[PDB]
Amino acid sequence: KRSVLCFGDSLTWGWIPVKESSPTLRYPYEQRWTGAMAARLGDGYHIIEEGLSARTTSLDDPNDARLNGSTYLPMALASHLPLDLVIIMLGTNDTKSYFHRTPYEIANGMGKLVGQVLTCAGGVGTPYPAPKVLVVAPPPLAPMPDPWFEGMFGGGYEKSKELSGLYKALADFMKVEFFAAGDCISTDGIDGIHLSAETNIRLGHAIADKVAALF
Amino acid sequence: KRSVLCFGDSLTWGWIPVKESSPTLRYPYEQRWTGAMAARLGDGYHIIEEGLSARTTSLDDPNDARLNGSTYLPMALASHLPLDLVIIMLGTNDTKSYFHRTPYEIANGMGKLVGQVLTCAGGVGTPYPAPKVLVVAPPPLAPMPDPWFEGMFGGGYEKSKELSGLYKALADFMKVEFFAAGDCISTDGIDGIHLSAETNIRLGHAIADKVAALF
Amino acid sequence: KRSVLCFGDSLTWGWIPVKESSPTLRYPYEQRWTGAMAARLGDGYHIIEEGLSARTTSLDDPNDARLNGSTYLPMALASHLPLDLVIIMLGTNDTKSYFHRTPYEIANGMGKLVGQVLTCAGGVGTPYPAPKVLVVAPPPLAPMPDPWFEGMFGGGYEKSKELSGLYKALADFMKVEFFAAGDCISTDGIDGIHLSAETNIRLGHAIADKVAALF
Amino acid sequence: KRSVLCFGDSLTWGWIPVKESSPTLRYPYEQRWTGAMAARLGDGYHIIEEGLSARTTSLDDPNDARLNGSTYLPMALASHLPLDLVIIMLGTNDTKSYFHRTPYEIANGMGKLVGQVLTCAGGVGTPYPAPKVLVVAPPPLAPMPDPWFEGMFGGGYEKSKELSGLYKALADFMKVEFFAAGDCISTDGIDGIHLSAETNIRLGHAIADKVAALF
Amino acid sequence: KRSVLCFGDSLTWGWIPVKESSPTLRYPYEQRWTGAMAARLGDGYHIIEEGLSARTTSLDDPNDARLNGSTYLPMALASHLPLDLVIIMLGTNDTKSYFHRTPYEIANGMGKLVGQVLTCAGGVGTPYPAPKVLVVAPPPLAPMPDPWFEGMFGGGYEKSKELSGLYKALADFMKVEFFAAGDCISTDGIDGIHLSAETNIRLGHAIADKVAALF
Amino acid sequence: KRSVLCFGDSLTWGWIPVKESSPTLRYPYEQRWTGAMAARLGDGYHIIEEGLSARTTSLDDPNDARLNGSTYLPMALASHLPLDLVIIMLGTNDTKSYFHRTPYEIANGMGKLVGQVLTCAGGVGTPYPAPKVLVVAPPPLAPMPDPWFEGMFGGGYEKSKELSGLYKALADFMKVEFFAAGDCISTDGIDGIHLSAETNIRLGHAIADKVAALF
Amino acid sequence: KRSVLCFGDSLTWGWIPVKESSPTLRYPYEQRWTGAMAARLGDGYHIIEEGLSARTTSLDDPNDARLNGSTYLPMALASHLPLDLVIIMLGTNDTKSYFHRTPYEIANGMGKLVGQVLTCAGGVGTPYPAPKVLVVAPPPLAPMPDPWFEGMFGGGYEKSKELSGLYKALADFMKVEFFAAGDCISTDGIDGIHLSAETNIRLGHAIADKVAALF
Amino acid sequence: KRSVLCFGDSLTWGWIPVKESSPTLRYPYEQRWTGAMAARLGDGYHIIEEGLSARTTSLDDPNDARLNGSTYLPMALASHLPLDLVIIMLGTNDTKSYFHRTPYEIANGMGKLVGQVLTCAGGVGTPYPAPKVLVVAPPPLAPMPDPWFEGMFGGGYEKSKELSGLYKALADFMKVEFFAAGDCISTDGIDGIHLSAETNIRLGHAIADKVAALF
Structure with missing residues (x-):
């Protein structure tokens, strides 16, 4: 059996976009990209979900101690x-206004996460090798009707558009795998940030085909 | 389905005891207590595994920044x-010689984790409630033929015999559930620390019976 | 009775504006907005005052370790x-020149405080629930004849004009209550920062009307 | 009018002792020692309550960031x-087993708090002088029927018996006022830690007589 | 007798300007402003020198842990x-290129030091009152022939010109004394930073007049 | 002139022992050991006083951030x-009950200070060499009639008796100078900690004789 | 023999520029500038290599705790x-996009390292004197065909062109030696960052000529 | 060619024992164990020396920030x-009186260093594999004539005697190589801590045999 760890933010947790913006409920597993990917990959794969809403690549969030992805990833590995494989889809939250990060710094945070996977061989007391890495660039942000979300992501749209190219450059440099979510899907939720079930399913099917072919 | 998060150390991860002590392989899922519990609970339950070898309740390990359970649990929740339920089986590693913790301090560390579950309602932007908690006392330690493990757990056996009574008192105080694993299993692995597959399966079946009676 | 905690800065503590700028005396209780609110609410309400001059939402002041509101609020709750209710009137001090905060960052700091209230249920060992929240936007700054205060608040007036709109958006997002003080009062003190007794009393009466309609 | 700040732990907050140990409700104001003291002092005094369950003099609690009294007192002042006066009744929680503090270290923590009052003149931008200080030694602990509380306070009884003499020595040295609660009341709650309403009322009346005579 | 503490940087230590820029020797006491002030004041005054080359008001220097004035002043007091009096002449080093401080932030750092004096009553176990404070704005910088010093103070000249006005505003606000060194002397050393002996003597005489007028 | 820096605690600052223990006044210069030493050395020497009540060698005091000698000495040098010479008389305060330091640890803290002197050559931008070092063992403690001082120094008398032998061994190892004050004076103040003026003067005269023999 | 420590980044470690950018192999000793220098200096000299890929002067790299040169240099010395001599060739990595350092700040970081050498006399328990220092400006950056390296060094080329002039000014100020590598070599590797073997050998020969002229 | 890193304390640096205890000079390379090992191994081996007097396995020394071995080893690797191989001979300094470490904690600190080698594959941007590890237990301490060294190592002899057995157990557990220096040499220097040249040579020859047998 092959084991695949899916490390991400609200797009991976499965945040349902809603007209009141927040709070919201979670998509059932079969309507998450992780579940749809697992269905297509089949019973030879075991999918592990580690999605956390508001998670960043490598930034401490001022209001929530839980959100730095790089603080948690070594423990999760x-x-x-x-x-066999760690799929990482993060970076959208790094584009928030109050973080003041450049696109390169966001990609460099993704690089920190890739390095944590590549150096994790052995874990605590095992002979197991390091897994492969699939870097996923999230789809670009869209216009947001809610003024709190619009303020939250001020300046972020342009940054989100640059991540695909920079993540591709990163993945080539670090000799890992790459997938651009925006080549297959768009951010289609009413809030301009999150995804519909149908888009989660299309995304998971496409990632499944990448996974099956990368080993 | 009812979601059950299983938070623990090597006993939960599934460390196979071996003559060379370390390193070792992982039990397959159906030979882990988590998988055996999942099998007896049935398809109305969804099990989430969060087991990490060498994990403590609330201590920083001097050689490994991944091992403080309380650093990770809020993010995991x-x-x-x-x-619906968080099962926590931890405390054995807090008895290691170099931590110098009293049994009450170990139970108080378990209490820190219980509190993290009880106050977790809402997560990041959800209306979901706090789950129930099942505190599990691990079985006492046993003779260790490897001198490195014997030094690692110097003074720990006597502390391990006190955890069950103190965890019961904690659980009554915090108004959560409690299971004494040592009434049902013993530490039967060749290394004096870990468990056989047959014992994992017995444990998981016994925990499943306890969980079912809560719902 | 219904308990109302009033969390704020000098506008809540009751700084009397004076020609020498500083130091100054405190308004008596019946000339504070808190006391005037208490008088109009009547004996079914119990007011708790937590006003601190120079307090910020969520910033460490370089000269004074007492001033980060978010450091203190969980203990105070x-x-x-x-x-039953927490009224928060803060943000003016975050506009000071040496903090270099954007208006969105100031509102996000208010959001940190709102979240601390919303997650406070139980306190230390109680079954009590989380109270409601009333976010109050302070009135915009005014001309400052003292050159030290003018330097202190350089760039702050323009930021102060944006807080009301952003606080309304925050409150709608977090599903709490909102009052725009600038619809009812102006910053009328001689120093361009603080308020007259007549204006405190008008503010407290207006907030009282808002509070009564919540219960 | 004279203002009196009452800084304390669950004995000041007003924890009702209960057979299930925890959680519990709060005494109404007239059944707290603070309220009973205010009634006896009369309308020439304004009492300010700052009681926090589980608060220590100057120790960080491993499971709760809210509990170090010395972290909060400067802000509260x-x-x-x-x-005009700050009354401080703390030290009981410093005797808990997991803190491993000697009686002198507990009294020295009280001394830290006394110094914070004596050096607080001016606050933020006022001409107000430092208040007087009344150090109150809490009554000694009693036997505890609940095993979790008994473990929590292991070794603490003897320490609690030494605080009166050491706090008297401290108050004489620092030239402030002293009152031994144990000269008037005993710890009479079922849990061996907290107080009955009747004892709260006796205590507040006696502290009121000390206050009226100390200026 | 009355005691006067002189807290400063190289201008107070007595750095002799030299063509090679650095290293250099110290002026003898009678050619320092402190010794010249002491001579004019007479033997009714005891002068204490605390001058440290490269010292800032309140900034940590990246290359030298000794240089934050506000870290050392409470201990020195x-x-x-x-x-009876603390004379503070600092701010020039805060204008260095690599600190990126605005003039207001420099004056606010001086304000931190003024506050440390005003709150220092008692010291360790004494009844002594807080000293008075004389804030001294240093003379503005001059053109610098050495390229390393020119880089070191890039952007600093303009900032040094603004300190007099801002320090005057600060001293009025905090109700302490003020003296503009630039009303009496100029920076006349060959390096564009330090002072000649005759200028130190003129400066000390003028400060002595200010000190004598206060007492 | 030859410059001599005198680095110490209350014995150097000049704490007057008094019947009420604290607070107290400072001995005049002529009644300090520093001033008595200066008089006997004469006008070829310049004495610099750096005495701070309650100062330790290298310990952080829990109640006062001013008191670690090793934090301040590099800046002072x-x-x-x-x-030409640094005289260090410290260690008595390291024997306080709440520090739990062994006599060797106290001497090792003195060693930290000696090293700071030996490595201080050049200061900030000067060619000056490192000075010589005179390590002074303070006299042993004496009976303490005040219960607060008795508790403060519990266990400390026996440690104070060992400092001289250990400081001699330190000074020989580090190749610096050593004077045992306890051969010439005893702790004669009423409080069992501090010194009479007559004893200060005898100490300073004895240290002056030692200093002169070094040059 | 005369001992020469060579402290640097990948230019000193010997990173082989390659078409796929990373990872890469290390040049053999004979193809490193250090080994080429050693050969030309001959058997009267002993070369010590301390080159670390990605090392900065004095910056913490967000992704790698190994990379701050100033953290490691005191231990290495x-x-x-x-x-007898420390050669330092660093600064290129400080020009990376995500550090946002000015050229003067980079030279000031070099200055931190120079100071660490100049103050290192004695080491741990030896009489040895501080060595001489040779500051080496690296050659400017060149076109980078790999998009990841291009992003990594955005803004850095222009900063790299200013380092030589600033390092010369630093070395004159601090009274140490200076060599401008860009007078003798250019950055000739395919990646626009690293060097060919022929260029390493030419550099080492040129540095050897400089070193010999010092002794 | 194969490269061997020798990571150690004064026994590896080459401290010459001397009657005055300290300071002292360094043995020439051919009288160090490293140089003697290199001579026996031949020019197919490249030896890298990283010996630092007073270095510990994993402890911060109170008086010197350079001495934690585990802080520096990742950078050195x-x-x-x-x-090809890292030889680690450390632990003697962890036995010093003021560290209060148990023998197991010392061996666990060695374990931290072993883990840093085993996880170091790649370094910064290379394909190179992790080296092998040779753990060397140092020879036990001897009686020490100097009283400062005797105090420094109080309690340490017994601890030094236990390191061989514990390091053997550690090396077996971690599956690395082990050599007991005390099976071949004794601590023969006049100070009871360091070694003679002939003993360094015997030690290096014996370690070379171990190294050659591995390859």
Whole structure:
């Protein structure tokens, strides 16, 4: 059996876009991209979900101590070995206005996460090798009707558009795999940030085909 | 389905005891207590595994920044809501010689984790409620033929015999559920620390019976 | 009775504007907005005052470790449960020149405080629920004849004009209550920052009307 | 009018002792020692309550960031100036097993708090003088029927018996006022830690007589 | 007798300007402003020198842990009580290119130091009162022939010109004394930063007049 | 002139022992050991006083951030170069009950300070060499009639008796100078900690004789 | 023999420029500038290599805790005394996009390292003197065909052109030696960052000529 | 060619024992164990010396920030790749009186260093594999004539005697190589801590045999 760890933010947790913006409920597994990917990959794969709303690549959020992805990823890797592949879809939250990050710095944060996977061989007391890495660039942001979300992501749209190219450059440099979500889907939720079930399913099917071919 | 997050150390990850002590392989899912519990609970339950070898309740390990359970649990809870129950089986590693913790301090560390579950309602932007908690006392340690493990757990056996009584008192105080694993299993692995497959399966079946009676 | 905690800066503490700028005396209770609110609400309400001159939403002041509102609020909430409502009037001091904060960052700091209220249920060992929240936008700044105050608030007037709209958006997003003080009062003190007794009393009466309609 | 700040733990917050140990409700104001003291002092005094369950003199609690009294007292003083007197009743929680503090270290923590009052003149931008200080030694602990509380306070009884003498020595040295609660009341709650309403009322009346005579 | 603490940077230590820029020797006491001030004041005054080359008001220097004035001043005050007056001449080093401080932030750092004096009453275990404060704005910088010093103070000249006005506003606001060194002297050393002996003597005489007028 | 920096605690600052223990006044210069030493050395020497009540060698005091000698000494050395000699009389406060330091640890803290002197050559931008070092063991403690001082120094008398032998061994190892004050004076103040004026003067005269023999 | 410590980044470690950018192999010693220098200096000299890919002067890299040169240099100096000369070639990595450092700040970081060498006399328990220092400006950057390297060094080329002039000014100020590598070599590797073997050898020969002229 | 990194304390740096204890000179390379090992191994081996007097396995020394071995080892590994073998001889300094470490904690600190080698594959941007590890238990301490050294190592002899057995157990557990220096040499220097030249040579020859047998 092959084990695949899916590390992400609200797009991976499965945030349902809603007209009142927040709070919201979670998509059932079969309507998450992770579940749709698992269905297409089949029973030879075991999918592990680690999606956290508002998670960044490598930034401490001023209002929530839980959100730095790089703080949690080493622990998660060691908890889930043996792993064949880690899929990482993050970066959208790094584009928020109050973080003042350049696109390159966001990609460099993704690079920190890739390095944490590449150096994780052995975990705590095992002979297991490092898994492969699939870097996923999230789809670009869209216009947002809610003024709080619009303020939250001020300046972020242009940054989100640059991530695909920079993540491709990063993945080539670090000799790992790459997939641009925006080549297959768009951000289609009413809030301009999150995704519909149908788009989650299309995304998971497409990632499944990438996974099946990358080993 | 009812979601059950299983938070623990190597006993939960599934460390196979071996003659060379370390390193070792992972039990397959159906030979882990988590998988055996999942099998007896049936398809109305969804099990989430968060087991990490060498994890403590609330201590920083001097050689490994991944191992403080309380550093990770809030992030894990928010990543996995909605949750109906969190089962926590930890404390054995707090008995290691170099931590110099009293049994009450170990139970108080378990209490820190219980509190993190009880106050987690809402996660990141959801209306979901806090789950129930099942505190599990691990079975006492056993003779260790490897001198490195014997030094690692110097003074720990006597502390391990006190955890069950103190965890019961904690659980009554905090108004959560409690299971004494040592009434049903013993630490039967060749290394004096870990468990056989047959014992994992017995444990998981016993925990499943306890969980079913809560719902 | 219904308990109302009033969390704020000098506008809440009751700084009397004076020709020498500083130091100054405190308005008596019946000339504070808190006391005037208490008088119009009547004996079914119990007011708790937590006003601190120079307090910010969520910033460490370089000269004074007492001034980060978010450092203190969780302790204050647990000390005063049971609470029915928390009124927060802060943000003016975040506009000071040496903080270099954008208006969105100031509102996001207010959001940190709102979240601290919303997640405070139980306090230390109680069954009490989280109180409601009333976010109050302070009135915009005014001309400052003292050159030290003018330097202190350089760039702050323009930011102060944006807080009301952003606080309304925050409150709608977090599903709490909102009052724009600038619809009812102006910053009428001689120093361009603080308020007259007549204006405090008008503010408190207006807030009282808002509070009564919540219960 | 004279203003009196009452800084304390669950004995000041007003924890009702209950057979299930925890959680519990709060005494109404007239059944707290603060309220009973205010009734006896009369309308020439304004009492300010700052009681926090589980609060220590100057220790960080491993499971709760809210509980170090010395972290909060400077902020509270500046928020409540002008003050004529600060009454401090703390130390019981410093005797808990997991803190491993000697009686002298507990008294030295009380001394830290006394110094914070004595040096607080001016607050933020006022001409107000430092208030007087009344150090109150809490009554000694009693036997505890609940095993979690008994473990929590292991070794604490003897420490609690030494605080009166050491706090008297401290108050004489620092030239402030002293009152031994144990000379008037005993710890009479079922849990061995907290107080009955009748004892709260006796205590507040006795502190009121001390206050009226100390200026 | 009355004691006067002189807290400063190289202008107070007595750096002799030299063509090679650095290193250099110290002026003898009678050619320092402190010694010249002491001579004019007479033997009714005890002068304490605390001058440190490269010292800032309140900034940590990246290359030298000794240079934050506000880190050392509280210790120095307590070491030198009883004190009648503290003279503070700092701010020039805050204008260095790599600190990126605005003039207001520099004056606010001076304000931090003024506050440390005003709150220092008692020291460690004494009845002594807080000293008075004389804020001294240093003379503006001059053109600098050495390229390393020119880079070191890039952007600093304009900032140094603004300190007099801002320090005057600060001293009025905090109700302390003020003296503009630039009303009496100029920066006349060959390096564009430090002062000649005759200028130190003129400066010390003028400061002595200010000190004598206060007492 | 030869410059001599005197770095110490209350014995150097000049704490007057008094019947009420604290607070107290400072001995005049002529009644300090520093001033008595200066008089006997004469006008070829320049004495710099750096005495701070309650100062330790290298410990952070829980109640006062001013008191770690090793935190302040590097800044003080650079402020006072050129220096021919640093006299260090510290260690008594390290024997306080709440520090739990062994006598060797106290001498090792003295060693930290000696090293700071030996490595201080050049200061900030000077060619000056490192000064010589005179390590002074303070006299042992004596009976303490005040219960607060008795508790403060519990266990400390026996440690104070060992400092001289250990400081001699330190000074020989580090190749610096050593004077045992306890051969010439005893702790004669009423409080069992501090010194009479007559004893200060005898100490300073004895240290002066030692200093002169070094040059 | 005369001992020469060579402290640097990938230019010193010997990164082989390659078409796929990363990862890469290390030049053999004979193809490193260090080994080429050693050969030309001959057997009267002993070369110590301390080159680390990605090392900065004095910056913490967000992704790698190994890379701050100033964190490691004091330990390295004490490990290798006696030393006659330290050659430092660093600064290129400080020009990376995500550090946002000005050229003067980069030279000031070099200055931090120079100071660490100049103040290292004695090491741990030795009489050895501080070595001489040779500051080496690296050659300017060149076109970078890999998009990841291009982003990594955005803004850096222009900064790299200013380092030589600033390092010369630093070395004159601090009274140490200076060599401009860009007078003798250019950045000739395919990646626009690293060097060919022929260029390493030419550099080492030119540095050897400089070193010999110092002794 | 194969590269061998020698990571150690004064026994590796080459401290010459001397009657005055300290300071002292360094043995020439051919009288160090490293140089003697290199001579026996031949020119197919490249030896890298990283010895630092007073270095510990994993402890911060109170008086010197340079001495934690585990702080420096990751940087040194990355600087010296490609490496075939890392030889680690440390632990003697962890036995010093003021560290209060148990023998197991010392061996666990060695374990931290072993783990840093085993996880170092790649360094910064290379394909190189992790080196092998040779753990060397240092020879036990001897009686020490100097009282400062005797105090420094109080309690340490017994601890030093236990390191061989514990390091053997550690090396077996971690599956690396082990050599007991005390099976071949004794601590023969006059100070009871360091070694003679002939003993360094015998030690290096015996370690070379171990190294050659591995390859």
